[PDB]
Structures are given as structure tokens and as C-alpha cells.
């Protein structure tokens, strides 16, 4: 089995600039190497075949080079739409083997998150449960800390956090935090607070509502 080792797990540039990802083969594969692009939630998309030839519909910004063991995929004029994980592959020897994958990252200025809080819907309250949802949209960098407070007491259980990948439009990140309680617990308290600690402010962003 031939191993395809991509040196970097992540490659970083700014919008408009260029990136390159390298792939190392354990044994010689000549030029029978392919490159693939896979956006979140989609099937892979073949970009390069024969190390340097492009599939139909692939822009010339994607350029492949290399022969033997060292191969390179270069993307010029990188845009937010190009955010994806990129794989190399050899079809010179069986079994066909892929690279581990390199995820593209984009540097950009800091951005404070837009925070929105939502009480439990009346529909869910009929089911006996109660989920409070907090949206934290379009921030950078991806590092962020969210705390839930119930009448001042912090709740670090029954919380479900989800992060989006880097946004395909403005290269920001977004977070969804959901605190789930039973309907009894929900009606046993009044103040529900979503606190967000981000680099963009030394003070936390606070969105709350009083059940009252």
C-alpha cells in the first residue's frame, strides 16, 4: 500500500492571495495523481488528474504540479468559496490510496459576534422539555467561550454547542448554544442569560430574557 502524506493539516492565506499543499508518496507513482475538493456537507469534487490536468469546470486558479513522489496543488486568487478540505490521491498502484486531507483557512480581521437569544417555543413546552437557544453569528477568530446563567447560577450541563466551518462568504465563524431543561425546571426560574466571551471585547456580550 502506497502512503500519501500531506504535510499540513491546515493551510492559511488571505482572500486574493495563493496557497499550496504538498503530497508525499511512499513509492514512485509517476504522474498518476489526482486532487479533490470537498466542501462541508457535499460529495468530493475532482479538481486535478494526471498531477497537472484539470477536470472540466475547474478554474485555472487550481494548478497541479509534480512528478514521482513530490506533488503540489496551488490555488491562486483564493476566495471564501474555496474553503474546503483538499485531498491528494494516487491511482498508479492498487489499492488506490488518498491523502489525509488539508483544510483551507483564511485570515481576516477580528469580528465581534452577533448574539441572539430565544426562549423555549410553546410547541416544545407541550412536550415537557424546554430548550433555550443562543446564536453567535459571524465572529473571528473561531475561539469563543459561552456560559449559561440561570438566575445568576452557571449551568454547564445539558448544553449542546455546535460550530460552523469558516463561512463561505465572509470567512467568519458561527456558534449555536442550546441549553435544554425540563419544563418544570424552566418554570422554576426567571432570568436566563447567554454570556459570550470573545477576544473582540474584554467584557462579555450578554443576551438575556426574564420569563416573568
Partner 1 sequence: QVQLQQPGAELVKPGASVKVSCKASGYTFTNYWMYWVKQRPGQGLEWIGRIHPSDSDTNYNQKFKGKATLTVDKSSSTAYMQLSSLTSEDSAVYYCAIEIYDGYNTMDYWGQGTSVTVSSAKTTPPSVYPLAPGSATNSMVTLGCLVKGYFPEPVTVTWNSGSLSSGVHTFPAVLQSDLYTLSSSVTVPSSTWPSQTVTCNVAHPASSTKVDKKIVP
Ligand X SMILES: CCC(=O)N(c1ccccc1)C1CCN(CCNC(=O)CCCC(=O)NCC(=O)NCC(=O)NCC(=O)NCC(=O)O)CC1
List contacts with partner 1 (CB under 8 A): 36, 38, 43-46, 49, 53, 55-57, 85, 87, 89, 94-101, 114, 116-121, 123-124, 127, 131, 133, 135, 137, 153-154, 156-157, 160-164, 167, 169, 174-176, 178, 209
Nearer to ligand X (CB atom), residue 50 or residue 161: 50
Q: Are 65 and 79 in contact (CB under 8 A)?
A: no
Nearer to ligand X (CB atom), residue 25 or residue 134: 25
212 touches, from ligand X, a second copy, partner 1, none (C-beta below 5 to 8 Å by class): none
- Rounded Cα distance, 159 and 195, in Å: 13
Look up residue 29 and give its three cell numbers: 507513482
> Which residues contact ligand X (rule: CB under 6 A)?
34, 46, 49-50, 89, 91, 96
Residue ranges of E strands in the chain: 4-6, 10-13, 19-25, 33-38, 45-49, 53-54, 62-67, 70-75, 85-90, 97-98, 102-106, 114-118, 129-139, 145-150, 153-154, 159-163, 173-182, 191-197, 205-210
Nearer to partner 1 (CB atom), residue 15 or residue 117: 117
> Which residues contact a second copy (rule: CB under 8 A)?
28, 30, 32, 92-94, 141, 143-145, 147, 151-154, 156, 190-191, 193, 197-199, 202-204, 206, 208
Question: In whole angstroms, how close is the CB of 202 to a second copy at the nearest point?
Answer: 6
Question: In whole angstroms, how close is the CB of 209 to partner 1 at the nearest point?
Answer: 5
* 3 CB neighbour count, 10 Å cutoff: 12
Question: In whole angstroms, how close is the CB of 51 to partner 1 at the nearest point?
Answer: 14
- Pairing assessment for the beta strands 70-75 and 19-25 based on DSSP bridges: antiparallel
* 41 CB neighbour count, 10 Å cutoff: 6
Amino acid at each position: 500500500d502506497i502512503v500519501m502524506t500531506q504535510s499540513q493539516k491546515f493551510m492559511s492565506t488571505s482572500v486574493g492571495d495563493r496557497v499550496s499543499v504538498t503530497c508525499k508518496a511512499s513509492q514512485n507513482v509517476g504522474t498518476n495523481v489526482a486532487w479533490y475538493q470537498q466542501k462541508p456537507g457535499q460529495s468530493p469534487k475532482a479538481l486535478i488528474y494526471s498531477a497537472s490536468y484539470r477536470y472540466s469546470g475547474v478554474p485555472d486558479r487550481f494548478t497541479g504540479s509534480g512528478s514521482g513522489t513530490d506533488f503540489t496543488l496551488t490555488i491562486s486568487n483564493v476566495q471564501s468559496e474555496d474553503l474546503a478540505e483538499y485531498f491528494c490521491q494516487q491511482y498508479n498502484n492498487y489499492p488506490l490510496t488518498f491523502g489525509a486531507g488539508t483544510k483551507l483557512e483564511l485570515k481576516r480581521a477580528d469580528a465581534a459576534p452577533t448574539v441572539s437569544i430565544f426562549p423555549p417555543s410553546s410547541e416544545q413546552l407541550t412536550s415537557g422539555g424546554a430548550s433555550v437557544v443562543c446564536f453567535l453569528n459571524n465572529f473571528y477568530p473561531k475561539d469563543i467561550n459561552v456560559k449559561w446563567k440561570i438566575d445568576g447560577s452557571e449551568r454547564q450541563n445539558g448544553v449542546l454547542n455546535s460550530w460552523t466551518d469558516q463561512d463561505s462568504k465572509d470567512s467568519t465563524y458561527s456558534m449555536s448554544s442550546t441549553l435544554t431543561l425540563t419544563k418544570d425546571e424552566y418554570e422554576r426560574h426567571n432570568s436566563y442569560t447567554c454570556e459570550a466571551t470573545h477576544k473582540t471585547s474584554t467584557s462579555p456580550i450578554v443576551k438575556s430574557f426574564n420569563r416573568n
